[PDB]
Amino acid sequence: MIVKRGDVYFADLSPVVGSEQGGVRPVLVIQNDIGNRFSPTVIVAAITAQIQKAKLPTHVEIDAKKYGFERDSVILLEQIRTIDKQRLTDKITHLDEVMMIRVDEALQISLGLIDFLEHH
Amino acid sequence: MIVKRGDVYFADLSPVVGSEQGGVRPVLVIQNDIGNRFSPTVIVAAITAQIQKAKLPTHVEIDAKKYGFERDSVILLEQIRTIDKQRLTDKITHLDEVMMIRVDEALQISLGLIDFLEHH
């Protein structure tokens, strides 16, 4: 119910079609905190353990040791979903300010809000 | 490329969970144009004709007459989704720069990059 931006929860993103990221996996809350408190829905970015290195400017690496993670992981700002809050299950961790500034950069690049080819 | 940021397509969003927007409905391409060229996925915002007027800062009105819609509609920047391109069916229209400026502001608000409302 009462999530905060920067929180990481488990969520089932299934069912999916084609190259949509499915499965029960960590997701990062990226919605504003007004909707996070008051809305039945939340906007999340999928997290994967299939890669550990950011290949693209829409990727942000998570160090497993520093956070709640079993494996070094990558937040995929190209894989964003508005999900009903019923999909969220247990909380895993909360990302710090420096991590979220990286997230904001990748998220703005993903959504064409700032330049893709610029180093910011 | 396939689609361009600002393109509006029908997309088959079914099935969904809870308060997620579903069905076959118009959606607005909001992913950057580099991703739109190369990626199998596209990021979109759901459009609804259940509401005609924007009374929340995450909402942008679409005038049907101007844009070749059947019914005046609202773009819901709190309802955004990465979908496989296979979900896109027919192109409806392309929103102009004035509309896309309003979208970008609604997206910044939705995603907590600027204040949700003006703070006294």
CB contact under 8 A, A41 and B20: yes
Longest dimension (CA), chain A: 38
CA distance B88 to B109: 26
List the single residue in A with minimal CA-CA distance to B35.
Answer: A110
CB of A2 closer than 8 Å to CB of A37: yes
CB of B87 closer than 8 Å to CB of B79: no
CB of A86 closer than 8 Å to CB of A6: no
Residues of A in contact with B33 (CB under 8 A): 112
B68 near A CB under 8 A: no
CA distance A8 to A10: 7
CB of B113 closer than 8 Å to CB of A108: yes
Experimental approach: X-ray
Q: What angle do CA B92, B95, B99 make, to 5 degrees?
A: 145
CB contact under 8 A, B30 and A107: no
SS3 content of chain B, % helix, strand, coil (to 5): 20, 35, 40
Cα atoms in the 13 Å half-sphere on the side-chain side of A76:
24
A58 near B CB under 8 A: yes
Please give the CATH number for the structural domain made up of A1-120.
2.30.30.110
Buried b (16+ CB within 10 A) or exposed e, B62-97: beeeebebeebbbbbbbbbbbbbbebbeeebbbbee
Q: How many CB atoms lie within 10 A of CB B4?
A: 12
Residues of B in contact with A46 (CB under 8 A): 82
Nearest CA distance, A19 vs chain B (angstrom)? 6
Residues of B in contact with A20 (CB under 8 A): 41, 82-84
